[PDB]
Design a protein around this ligand. Structure first.
Ligand SMILES: O=P(O)(O)O[C@H]1[C@H](OP(=O)(O)O)[C@@H](OP(=O)(O)O)[C@H](OP(=O)(O)O)[C@@H](OP(=O)(O)O)[C@H]1OP(=O)(O)O
Ligand SMILES: [Cl-]
Ligand SMILES: [Cl-]
Ligand SMILES: [Mg+2]
Length: 134
């Protein structure tokens, strides 16, 4: 069930999934519509679901990782698609071999240096590239 802010923006949460507390390498996943493209894992908040809980759930489902939830980076809007995403830091400590989206849609995941994550996100996901700006 999709959820919405009072202005009709779809509510989402995502994590920047870093290998370590150095925050030098981040985990991206393949787009569902266009698997040769990369995105930051994330998705819709469920009814009454805390944003931090949605963020951790979505990255388990999409990226097959778990770890130590860190700070909220910020809340980011996509004007064209009308959604508003809470973006958290997650320090990955568990990498699961088979995860929901690997099994269901053959979703891929890959580690990127921050500068390379920004590069591959820029064309189709410039707001997600902006997650990294600070
Ligand atoms: O229309 P697309 O380009 O395929 O994009 C879709 C769409 O995102 P937009 O809202 O930016 O269009 C989905 O959202 P809904 O249509 O379900 O509201 C989203 O699902 P989430 O917001 O829950 O992530 C899904 O992404 P995914 O399959 O990664 O969950 C994402 O496709 P991509 O981001 O993979 O291209
Ligand atoms: Cl790192
Ligand atoms: Cl976006
Ligand atoms: Mg998603």
């Amino acid at each position: 069930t999709r959820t919405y802010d009072g202005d009709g923006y779809k509510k989402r949460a995502a994590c920047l999934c870093f290998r370590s507390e150095s925050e030098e390498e981040v985990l991206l996943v393949s787009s569902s519509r266009h698997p040769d493209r990369w995105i930051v894992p994330g998705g819709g908040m469920e009814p009454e679901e805390e944003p931090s809980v949605a963020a951790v759930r979505e990255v388990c489902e999409e990226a097959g990782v778990k770890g130590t939830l860190g700070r909220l980076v910020g809340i980011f809007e996509n004007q064209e698609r009308k959604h508003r995403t809470y973006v958290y830091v997650l320090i990955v400590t568990e990498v699961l071999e088979d995860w929901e989206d690997s099994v269901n849609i053959g979703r891929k995941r890959e580690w990127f240096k921050i500068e390379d994550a920004i590069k591959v996100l820029q064309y189709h996901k410039p707001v997600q590239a902006s997650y990294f700006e600070t």
